[PDB]
Design a protein around this ligand. Structure first.
Ligand SMILES: CCc1nc2ccc(N(Cc3ccccc3)C(=O)c3cccs3)cc2c(=O)n1Cc1ccc(-c2ccccc2-c2nn[nH]n2)cc1
Ligand SMILES: CCCCCCCC/C=C\CCCCCCCC(=O)OC[C@H](O)CO
Ligand SMILES: CCCCCCCC/C=C\CCCCCCCC(=O)O
Length: 410
């Protein structure tokens, strides 16, 4: 009777046809699917709930099941004729109609306006602007560590590692700009959908985690000033491989779920997160929650604790003259890294959380969902913009941070 119960019946019986031996097992599973499809056709989905049945989107919902019943009948005729393997092969087309429903009515397909007025759009233009700016500033930091500075100092190792993680992350921007321009048509294959997808997640986490390491190292330098006096930076050689391995382990679900799947309504081959279709909404909300916790929640708490910790040790001294001037300058540099992390990542994680609620069934309003969809590529751009801000805050401007920290300590 219920829409959730009807789609559970449709998915469970699709697996039965695959495991079926004779025509009787195929006929039984198709009849159960035929009854569930006509029952779901009568029901109203959580999305577009406050809409009349005469509406074109409601007419399209009923028509979606008319294609499904028509496809069931074609396979049922082969099953009634004795053709077992032919009916099972015909039942593979039902999976395409099933995937069309999860993309349109469970996803943002029916809400967001599909027609795209692509004529040198702002997204590919802004993506290439951030690319060349970010690539040029990060190349300077990488080339400086190679033949202009050296491999000395604890903090300096993290500067180079953050610059490499940022450079490789910004290097993926021309791919996404081309991917956007072709109306989400992945022209690299299902193998490169996993490769580029994981490479993006790996370098993104490596960037975020090295920012976290910088905050911990900056905090440790204040509370324990004896650490900088140490001739040997023993922990640095073990922290760097651990962070890269943590970024690799975090990019594992990306390598497992990313795959090129055909979008039935758009008529495009998109590199999407191919979760099990029977529990697609649950997986989409779970991974979106994982994005917020691991990529924003845990690092922001670490970055803030380190900032308030430096503020606690500095403000209790009650300085006068140049000691007060140099103190305030250190506090402005320490606040700049926490502020830049918020401005650049908060819009994305808020929209990711709002999108997670849309999958669960909390946000069903198409007006809200349409805004989330068009704002998302701009929010993604802000995440990449953090990689352009990083060389300035840590290498260029943040070079006098260690000198001013040694000035207040004398
Ligand atoms: C700034 C970094 C970034 N660049 C991106 C570039 C492009 C896109 N888009 C949408 C797009 C395409 C073209 C133009 C504009 C938008 C895509 O379709 C693809 C992404 C990966 C392969 S295709 C998304 C992102 C994007 O969400 N992010 C942030 C981010 C957040 C979370 C995770 C993550 C964490 C843990 C577990 C899994 C994931 C995970 N999310 N998506 N796949 N894997 C990874 C990356
Ligand atoms: C300097 C950077 C210029 C490189 C941009 C090349 C370009 O215009 O790309 C077209 C794109 O594939 C379509 O949106
Ligand atoms: C677009 C990045 C802007 C960064 C803002 C950080 C400045 C904080 C200083 C006050």
């Amino acid at each position: 009777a219920d829409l959730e119960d009807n789609w559970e019946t449709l998915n469970d019986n699709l697996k039965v046809i695959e495991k079926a031996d004779n025509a009787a097992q195929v006929k039984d599973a198709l009849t159960k699917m035929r009854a569930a499809a006509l029952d779901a056709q009568k029901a109203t989905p959580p999305k577009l709930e406050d809409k009349s049945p005469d509406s074109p989107e409601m007419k399209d919902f009923r028509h979606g099941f008319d294609i499904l019943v028509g496809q069931i009948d074609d396979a049922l005729k082969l099953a009634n004729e004795g053709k077992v393997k032919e009916a099972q092969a015909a039942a593979e087309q039902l999976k395409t109609t099933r995937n069309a429903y999860i993309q349109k009515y469970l996803g943002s397909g029916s809400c967001s306006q599909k027609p795209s007025d692509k004529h040198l759009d702002a997204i590919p233009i802004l993506y290439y602007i951030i690319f060349v700016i970010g690539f040029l500033v990060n190349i300077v930091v990488v080339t400086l560590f190679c033949c202009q500075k050296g491999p000395k100092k604890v903090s300096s190792i993290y500067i180079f590692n953050l610059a490499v993680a940022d450079l490789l992350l910004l290097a993926t921007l021309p791919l996404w700009a081309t991917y956007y321009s072709y109306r989400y048509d992945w022209l690299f294959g299902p193998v490169m959908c996993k490769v580029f997808g994981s490479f993006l997640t790996l370098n993104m986490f490596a960037s975020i985690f090295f920012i976290t390491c910088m905050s911990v190292d900056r905090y440790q330098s204040v509370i324990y000033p004896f650490l900088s006096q140490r001739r040997n930076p023993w922990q640095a050689s073990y922290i760097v491989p651990l962070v890269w391995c943590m970024a690799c382990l975090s990019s594992l679900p990306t390598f497992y779920f990313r795959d090129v799947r055909t979008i039935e309504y758009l008529g495009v081959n998109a590199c999407i997160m191919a979760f099990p279709p029977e529990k697609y909404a649950q997986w989409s909300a779970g991974i979106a929650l994982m994005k917020n916790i691991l990529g924003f929640i845990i690092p922001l708490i670490f970055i803030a604790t380190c900032y308030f910790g430096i503020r606690k040790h500095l403000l209790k001294t009650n300085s006068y003259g140049k000691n007060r001037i140099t103190r305030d300058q250190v506090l402005k540099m320490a606040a700049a890294v926490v502020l830049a992390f918020i401005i650049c990542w908060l819009p994305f994680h808020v929209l990711t959380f709002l999108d997670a609620l849309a999958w669960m069934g909390v946000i069903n309003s198409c007006e809200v969902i349409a805004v989330i969809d068009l704002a998302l590529p701009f929010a993604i751009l802000l995440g990449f913009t953090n990689s352009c801000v990083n060389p300035f805050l840590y290498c260029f401007v943040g070079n006098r941070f260690q000198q001013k920290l040694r000035s207040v300590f004398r």
